[PDB]
Ligand binder design. Structure first.
Ligand SMILES: CC1=C(C(=O)O)[C@@H]2CC(C)(C)c3c(C)c(C)cc4c3N2[C@@]12C(=O)NC(=O)N=C2N4C[C@H](O)[C@H](O)[C@H](O)COP(=O)(O)O
Ligand SMILES: CC1=C(C(=O)O)[C@@H]2CC(C)(C)c3c(C)c(C)cc4c3N2[C@@]12C(=O)NC(=O)N=C2N4C[C@H](O)[C@H](O)[C@H](O)COP(=O)(O)O
Ligand SMILES: [K+]
Ligand SMILES: [K+]
Ligand SMILES: [K+]
Ligand SMILES: [K+]
Ligand SMILES: [K+]
Ligand SMILES: [K+]
Ligand SMILES: [K+]
Ligand SMILES: [Mn+2]
Ligand SMILES: [Mn+2]
Lengths: 497, 497
């Protein structure tokens, strides 16, 4: 099976790219695995595969760190993400996002059922399960527990049986058979939890699959619409069905080649302390746990030589910045197009720590509307900031089509020189606010409301008669003849390549 | 004379450092010299010395591009700036700014007069001067003329004869005997021009000195206090006197080892079209000239084998960001400390395009003040935005003492995660605004007023009880024992040094 359809194939693809380190020396899942992974993420190095995890018993488990973090080589920067999606390792961030959006406007390719698969090679059931005895990583020294769940897919189905949601949400070991995990509004796992609560179901059938087909974990991190099952979306991206096997102890379906599956229930009543956790914005608050829902684990099934993927998230650059903001950006672009706004492209610049999205404006179309930045910024915010796909994003930066939104430097240049502070901004005090951002939960105003802005970084004339400047840069301030004469003589004269 | 006291010694210092390319092939000062210089600045390469400029006659002139731009080696990034100031090429940005501020707390060392110097080796006088015939560079294809003046020092003296100002302001060739150049409020060349206008002088004695002592060009770019002669401040930085020679045709004094000096007058009545120009924010507006004062040149004196320095400014990274923003940040730091604010450090992050200054707060001292972000942000903006040193800066970012303000990434992380948009900002509509920024002159509100902000990127607890988080990074989320084990294993395991 190809790398995009098998986590095991994906690991072999990273090994063939020279993008993986096999660590055969013993590594402690108590901080050491996470510390190596963190330094890989901070230096854009090769993905670490921990083949010798201290305390690993009965084939549980190896750990892969930094599954979707960046490569240092500029030409292959997004290569680990491209290997999730059958793209070449030289794929741009735009190629990745265009691919994830491609299933927006084709029929779903429905999953197919198989009677067994590698995920059924081993099992532990009922009283034999002790999650406290498994080598679950301590991901940050001040975390409130061992975060087993940083890169698995939660599988949960609506009461009408029509909607099977796949999503990533963190969870830590809580007890011998229990996890505690974030189940927050407006995420689909919480929307589905509340539907079961409302009809009186105490224990909701649930599964958590680790080392899923790479296309599936990408869809799990994407805010595709309410009531759309990720399985068919994934099939449409991959151009063929995901093969699913039924769980042994409930009626849910998991990918047949998953590394590890937990089967059990999500409670609508039982709560337990969850966190703290070193989260996507780069912060942990020692001692600050909050009640979260309890997951009960009734069976574990796993592959021989099982691998648990691990995101050691925090400061730049890990899966929380390469997947969460970027895939929200892709969905915000599509919402803006839906609403008839002249947006061609969107990206979440890494410098914004997954709180910023830059929206590229088709300025020809914009001039036909005969509007102004003040009116346009308000309309963009009113569309985006009252939708789930805009929940985590606190600053939208509107830029003209001379700016590459995929280049942090271009976006920051437009922001700093085209958006007059206060004057060119529209502030949103009444929309849902992402409480995980420190300036929200640990700030000066309501933790769950407001703190958003649309920054108009189009110059005044872009709305009326058009661009009337030239960049003072090599590309735009010198004629083609002069540029070519320089580039042809560059190395001969003594400059670097 | 050492490198920091002689431009010619400084050029040889860059050559000794392997930081200089001698281009002995013919290079056209019409766009080709600037195009090479611009690509050097965009790639942080070696400074280009054009030894064979097409149209050079009688020793006028060679050109040095990118005299104070960045090196590519991260340990010597600021080495070209350090060689202006008798600092090692490994000097930090903090070392450079501390050296430039060192003269504000010690008595000036007054310049010494010499009867002659290398700048008197050659002369062109009166009717023999034809500036349109000199190899003045065309710096950007859409500029309104040949900007001869991008890295020279204007010398102008007050009516009472006691204050001699040295500053950098652009000027272009206007005619056979004239330049036109920016003389804008609140700059000292404009304050002194207005002193002369008020007593009815039409033509003010003036000189422009190119390839001055590198310490002198750094002070020329720095907003030292009103009425302080830069000569004595430069002496104090260097710890010895600048040697000055009198001009032949007026009573002004210029560095005796300058490469090239123009002697003449600055008009108080006559203006000529000036610009457009590819300016510090990265923009040229083709066809958009504005009236500026006329300089008349009556004599040229120059060294054998004279070198004209040239700044091909625009997009990152050239002299306008390495010197203008950083030296303003230095003066803003000193202003904050004189106002009694707990500011330890300040820098102008390159991503702000010399419009942002980050201010590092002593949070132990802040807590002793018992204040809050709203009150403190307003006080900082009131102190800074009502002073000349704050004029070019539109955004101040206040950060706690865990942020390295010299590191653009740490500043952006603090700004993105610790400053609630709107809520944590104080906007300034009534202060002077820097019209050259496109969102000012080409924006939605008054070109010369407002458009400023202080962003409070201190979390709420920093003002009261103290830092209550840990960064989710390698340095802060893992114990020293774990960090040491990982660092000691790193290369053996197969990761990059
Ligand atoms: C906010 C999140 C995390 C955190 O910062 O603690 C935590 C970190 C980890 C586990 C590493 C993490 C990774 C590595 C990735 C790649 C994504 C997330 C997370 N975690 C969180 C979480 O615990 N809760 C949550 O609300 N969303 C999270 N997402 C994002 C969601 O997956 C995304 O919003 C989906 O679109 C949701 O699917 P639908 O509801 O639309 O079907
Ligand atoms: C704003 C400026 C420029 C521009 O962007 O066009 C232009 C570009 C060049 C020449 C390359 C340039 C360089 C390479 C450097 C290093 C500095 C400047 C400039 N130019 C300008 C200009 O034309 N007018 C201006 O008002 N200030 C300028 N400074 C900054 C001043 O030197 C500084 O503000 C001093 O502090 C002023 O001294 P005092 O008055 O305090 O004594
Ligand atoms: K393997
Ligand atoms: K239902
Ligand atoms: K999803
Ligand atoms: K604008
Ligand atoms: K020389
Ligand atoms: K000066
Ligand atoms: K704040
Ligand atoms: Mn969903
Ligand atoms: Mn001055």
């Amino acid at each position: 099976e190809p790398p995009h359809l098998s986590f095991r194939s994906f690991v072999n693809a990273l090994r063939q790219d020279g993008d993986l380190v096999d660590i055969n020396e013993p590594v402690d899942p108590d901080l050491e695995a996470a510390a190596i992974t963190r330094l890989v993420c901070e230096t854009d190095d090769k993905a670490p595969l921990f083949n010798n995890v201290i305390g690993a018993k009965d084939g549980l488990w190896r750990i892969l760190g930094a599954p979707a973090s960046l490569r240092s080589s500029p030409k292959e920067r997004f290569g680990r993400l491209a290997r999730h999606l059958a793209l070449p390792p030289t794929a741009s961030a735009k190629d990745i996002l265009d691919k994830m959006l491609s299933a927006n406007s084709i029929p779903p390719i429905e999953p197919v059922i198989v009677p067994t698969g590698p995920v059924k090679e081993n099992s532990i059931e009922g009283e034999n399960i002790d999650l406290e005895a498994l080598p679950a990583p301590m991901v940050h020294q001040s975390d409130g527990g061992k975060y087993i769940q940083t890169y698995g897919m939660h599988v949960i189905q609506s009461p009408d049986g029509c909607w099977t949601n796949w999503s990533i949400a963190r969870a830590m070991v809580s007890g011998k058979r229990t996890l505690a995990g974030l189940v927050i509004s407006p995420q689909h796992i919480r929307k589905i939890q509340d539907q079961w609560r409302a009809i009186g179901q105490e224990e909701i059938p649930w599964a958590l699959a680790f080392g899923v087909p790479p296309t599936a974990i990408m869809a799990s991190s994407m805010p595709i619409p309410d009531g759309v099952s990720e399985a068919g979306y994934v099939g449409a991206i991959a151009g063929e069905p995901i093969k699913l096997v039924k769980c042994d102890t409930n009626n849910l379906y998991v990918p047949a080649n998953s590394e590890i599956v937990l089967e059990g229930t999500l409670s609508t009543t039982k709560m337990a302390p969850e966190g703290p956790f070193g989260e996507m914005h780069g912060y942990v608050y020692p001692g600050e746990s909050h009640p979260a829902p309890v997951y009960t684990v009734n069976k574990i099934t796993y592959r021989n030589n099982a691998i648990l993927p691990m995101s050691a998230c925090g400061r730049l650059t890990d899966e929380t910045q390469t997947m969460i903001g970027t895939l929200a950006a892709a969905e915000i672009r599509q919402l803006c197009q839906r609403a008839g706004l002249p947006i061609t492209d969107a990206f979440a610049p890494f410098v914004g720590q997954a709180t910023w999205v830059a929206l590229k404006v088709d300025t020809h179309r914009l001039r036909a509307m005969k509007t102004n930045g003040k009116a346009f910024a308000k309309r963009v915010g009113d569309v985006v900031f009252t939708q789930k796909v805009g929940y985590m994003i606190h600053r939208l930066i509107l830029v003209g089509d001379d700016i590459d939104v995929y280049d942090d430097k271009d976006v920051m240049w437009a922001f700093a020189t085209r958006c007059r502070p206060g004057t060119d901004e529209v502030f949103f005090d009444d929309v849902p606010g992402f409480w995980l951002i420190p300036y929200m939960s640990h700030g000066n105003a309501e933790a769950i409301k407001g703190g958003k802005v649309v920054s108009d970084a189009l110059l005044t004339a872009e709305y009326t008669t058009g661009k009337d400047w030239e960049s003072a840069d090599f590309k735009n301030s010198y004629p083609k003849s002069i540029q070519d004469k320089v580039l042809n003589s560059w190395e001969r004269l003594g400059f670097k390549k």
